[PDB]
Amino acid sequence: VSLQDFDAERIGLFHEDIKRKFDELKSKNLKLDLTRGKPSSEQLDFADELLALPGKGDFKAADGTDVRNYGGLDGIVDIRQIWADLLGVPVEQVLAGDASSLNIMFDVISWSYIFGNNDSVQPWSKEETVKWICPVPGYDRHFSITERFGFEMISVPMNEDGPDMDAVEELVKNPQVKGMWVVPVFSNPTGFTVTEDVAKRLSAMETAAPDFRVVWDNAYAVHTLTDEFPEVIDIVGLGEAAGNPNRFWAFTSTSKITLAGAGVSFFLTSAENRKWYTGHAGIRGIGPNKVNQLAHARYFGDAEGVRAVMRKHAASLAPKFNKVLEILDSRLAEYGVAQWTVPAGGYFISLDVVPGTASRVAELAKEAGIALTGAGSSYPLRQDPENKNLRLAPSLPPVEELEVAMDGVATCVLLAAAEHYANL
Amino acid sequence: VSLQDFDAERIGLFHEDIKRKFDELKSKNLKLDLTRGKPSSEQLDFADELLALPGKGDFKAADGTDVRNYGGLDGIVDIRQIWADLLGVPVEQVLAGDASSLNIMFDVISWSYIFGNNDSVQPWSKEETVKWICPVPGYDRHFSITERFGFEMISVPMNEDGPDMDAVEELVKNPQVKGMWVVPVFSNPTGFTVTEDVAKRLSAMETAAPDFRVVWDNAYAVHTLTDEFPEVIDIVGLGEAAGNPNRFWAFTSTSKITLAGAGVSFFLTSAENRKWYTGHAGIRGIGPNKVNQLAHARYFGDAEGVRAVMRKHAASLAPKFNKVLEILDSRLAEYGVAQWTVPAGGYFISLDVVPGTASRVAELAKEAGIALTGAGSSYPLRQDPENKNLRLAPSLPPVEELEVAMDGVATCVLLAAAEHYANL
Ligand SMILES: Cc1ncc(COP(=O)(O)O)c(C=O)c1O
Ligand SMILES: Cc1ncc(COP(=O)(O)O)c(C=O)c1O
């Protein structure tokens, strides 16, 4: 019997039962935080050597470029080739920037708004209405960019194999629709991964806008919890093969590989998109930081060197995800109140509680000294229409803290569920 | 006797002789370049240690921030404080960014265009016409930004004490005029420096636009050629004292102090302007590269350490400027065909030749294998109405190449002038 099928008296009693546990949880006086989707100090220690790279006397890229001096908008060949080899794409596709791929995403959107993109009839700022496809649950920092530009964000379900392509293929037939966000591998926060079939559908679909763009933000391209690395779909190539070469603006970075905020970002896109981008970037400045790019190239040496680092991250993160999953199972399984993802990579676990209770869960956790990301945080304008989803971030705390914190979260899920069904 | 005073016969003899020298110059098959204000490899060698900084295990800012991990939009206190001490301003004024000040100048104009600034009644995108004041000769990369945005650029003289304030003060009465560029110390390319009197006038003037900004791009704030450091006017503080606290967006950077394109940029402005800036920068991303900021704080240690570096730069650069000036004196002075700046600091000499001939001098030079910046490059839209100005960049080449290159340039000046007088 799930809680929802408890009779009126049984759920009342269950409510009194679980409230005793909640009282015990509060008497612990916890101060714990499950909100931070960032690497732990242990993981940042792996790149300690990078703090001393590229090192005295070592300032030449593989083509002879003095990385210390001005110029070059594309990034240095050394780091571009490593990433091309890692991702299995032609090097010509790859541009290497500064330390933030979000910065580049914002820029390409803002330039499409101001100037138009290379396929635009006119700039997006001339449109009465710009709409933007948002697979949910998704990444708050993506949705914040589109919200700040005033675009009407239209949600679609993020499914196990990627965004619901029936819904997307329909929505893009509206010319107001100028693009879409997706995190295609270990998606933030669902852990779901776009299949080859879904990528093909995104690549071949017809859009009403001539200048429609998919942001393919492959932020977790190599970020496995296991020994297996996920497939890297050459999405820019798929767009080229389908006859929509300019469709995909693809990104990734080293922020959860080396240093979070001081890594190197990459922008992968078609020939025509890259000329558009560097023509605007060349007015914004002289070009990106080549020294940090050479530092990175030296640290990794080659693509296998990147995978070797990712195995260290996996070994550090795996027990943390395991603890969270173990606790959710032991406390909640029997009750039919919640569903959670079981990801094989990325930085998050996505938890769905009783619809109408996610805000209450986060409130109860807060009264108990446990910080959860708020209800709706993974949705545009922070509006989850079912008030059910919560994001869990296991990476930073030690396992002992995760155990305590999740045990408390589970109690909160149960109490909120008991309140909800008792009030019905 | 000046060349203009030669009679037909004497200018005909002079013309044949200088033409012969020019032919002799072309026969050398030179490949020399006086176009880019890039530090030499000798100057870049000074920061060899920075390639190893901040070094293994050293990753905490002075307030405890782990610089390896996400967050913080303002830059770290370590570098902000050093720059504050260097410039004699309160640390609260200073924001520290990534490796390009141009990126930030671009960004604040683009955001004023898109969103409006904090004093705007509406975005500049909604204006029929945006005008922008451009002291000339000035910096080509500034003008490119406002050209790219479609702003109508209105020229005013850059005089020895700064922009023509009688002209500026009149132009700013037009509400179409939204801002102005200035390089206020050792200006690119005149070497001129804004006086306290001119600064005060800029701070007190009445503008018809409520959201007018001066870009005070102090790229050469400490960039002495003589080891005497120029005055640092606290321009933000002067706007605050005059009752126009939001007027100034001030910038500087370490691109010509440490590593050109891998240094640290600074944005100095009022509390309300900083809040507006970081509000938008926080949507564009999670914040700047804190590791490079700590590397720079470790490299310099303090304000005096910055000043010691600048003295090394002066020792490297001063004999290159001196050689250029010696050649201009010995080849051109007697003929009354040219005038040039004699800068106490900065990266350039500004050369004015016979009006109507600058484009010809640059074409002659290019035929002879000597790259000069084109005619008009220090003017908006590359439009020098007198076709007389050329910019010379002595920093990159060794003195021996400067000698050869400048002797050639002088022969080009004289041939162009001889053609001009003979054609009358
Ligand atoms: C999907 C996604 N993209 C981008 C980022 C940030 O990347 P960067 O640090 O290169 O801006 C994150 C950080 O969590 C993320 O989850
Ligand atoms: C006036 C001026 N501003 C800004 C810059 C460069 O700024 P950054 O390298 O910090 O973009 C230069 C480069 O010399 C310059 O002459």
Short mmCIF file of N, CA and C in Angstrom, two decimals, chain A residues 41 44-53 259, chain B residues 52-61 65-68 291 294 298:
data_model
loop_
_atom_site.label_atom_id
_atom_site.label_comp_id
_atom_site.label_asym_id
_atom_site.label_seq_id
_atom_site.Cartn_x
_atom_site.Cartn_y
_atom_site.Cartn_z
N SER A 41 36.86 20.06 -2.67
CA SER A 41 38.29 20.40 -2.57
C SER A 41 39.14 19.21 -2.98
N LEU A 44 39.36 19.28 -6.75
CA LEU A 44 40.18 20.42 -7.18
C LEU A 44 41.69 20.14 -6.92
N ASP A 45 42.04 19.37 -5.85
CA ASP A 45 43.43 18.95 -5.61
C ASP A 45 44.04 18.13 -6.76
N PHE A 46 43.22 17.43 -7.58
CA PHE A 46 43.79 16.66 -8.65
C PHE A 46 44.60 17.51 -9.61
N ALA A 47 44.18 18.76 -9.81
CA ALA A 47 44.82 19.69 -10.82
C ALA A 47 45.84 20.64 -10.15
N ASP A 48 46.30 20.29 -8.97
CA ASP A 48 47.29 21.08 -8.29
C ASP A 48 48.47 21.51 -9.17
N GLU A 49 49.00 20.60 -9.96
CA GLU A 49 50.11 20.87 -10.93
C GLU A 49 49.79 22.01 -11.92
N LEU A 50 48.51 22.14 -12.33
CA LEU A 50 48.07 23.16 -13.27
C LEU A 50 48.26 24.58 -12.72
N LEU A 51 48.29 24.72 -11.39
CA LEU A 51 48.65 25.98 -10.74
C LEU A 51 50.09 26.48 -11.02
N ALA A 52 50.95 25.60 -11.54
CA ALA A 52 52.35 25.88 -11.88
C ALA A 52 52.61 25.75 -13.38
N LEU A 53 51.57 25.56 -14.20
CA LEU A 53 51.75 25.43 -15.63
C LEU A 53 51.35 26.71 -16.39
N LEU A 259 39.49 23.21 -13.08
CA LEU A 259 39.23 24.24 -12.10
C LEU A 259 37.94 24.93 -12.46
N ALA B 52 54.43 30.22 -13.74
CA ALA B 52 54.45 29.16 -12.70
C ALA B 52 53.59 29.50 -11.51
N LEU B 53 52.77 30.56 -11.60
CA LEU B 53 52.01 31.08 -10.46
C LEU B 53 50.54 30.81 -10.64
N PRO B 54 49.76 30.66 -9.57
CA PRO B 54 50.18 30.89 -8.21
C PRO B 54 51.00 29.75 -7.57
N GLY B 55 51.11 28.62 -8.22
CA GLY B 55 51.96 27.54 -7.75
C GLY B 55 51.19 26.50 -6.95
N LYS B 56 51.76 25.32 -6.84
CA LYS B 56 51.10 24.22 -6.18
C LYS B 56 50.70 24.58 -4.75
N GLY B 57 49.46 24.26 -4.36
CA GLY B 57 48.98 24.43 -2.97
C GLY B 57 48.57 25.85 -2.62
N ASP B 58 48.76 26.80 -3.54
CA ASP B 58 48.47 28.20 -3.23
C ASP B 58 47.21 28.71 -3.98
N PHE B 59 46.08 28.65 -3.30
CA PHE B 59 44.77 28.85 -3.95
C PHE B 59 43.74 29.50 -3.10
N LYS B 60 44.17 30.16 -2.01
CA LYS B 60 43.21 30.90 -1.22
C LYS B 60 43.49 32.38 -1.36
N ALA B 61 42.44 33.14 -1.65
CA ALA B 61 42.47 34.60 -1.61
C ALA B 61 42.55 35.02 -0.14
N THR B 65 38.69 32.83 0.10
CA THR B 65 38.02 32.26 -1.11
C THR B 65 38.92 31.21 -1.71
N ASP B 66 38.39 30.03 -2.00
CA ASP B 66 39.12 29.05 -2.79
C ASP B 66 39.05 29.49 -4.25
N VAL B 67 40.16 29.95 -4.81
CA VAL B 67 40.10 30.52 -6.20
C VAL B 67 39.86 29.47 -7.27
N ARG B 68 39.98 28.20 -6.90
CA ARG B 68 39.82 27.08 -7.85
C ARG B 68 38.38 26.75 -8.10
N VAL B 291 41.92 32.43 -10.50
CA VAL B 291 43.25 31.86 -10.41
C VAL B 291 44.29 32.79 -11.02
N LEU B 294 44.94 35.64 -8.76
CA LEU B 294 45.83 35.31 -7.62
C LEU B 294 47.26 35.18 -8.11
N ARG B 298 50.24 37.40 -6.50
CA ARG B 298 51.54 36.77 -6.10
C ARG B 298 52.74 37.29 -6.84
#
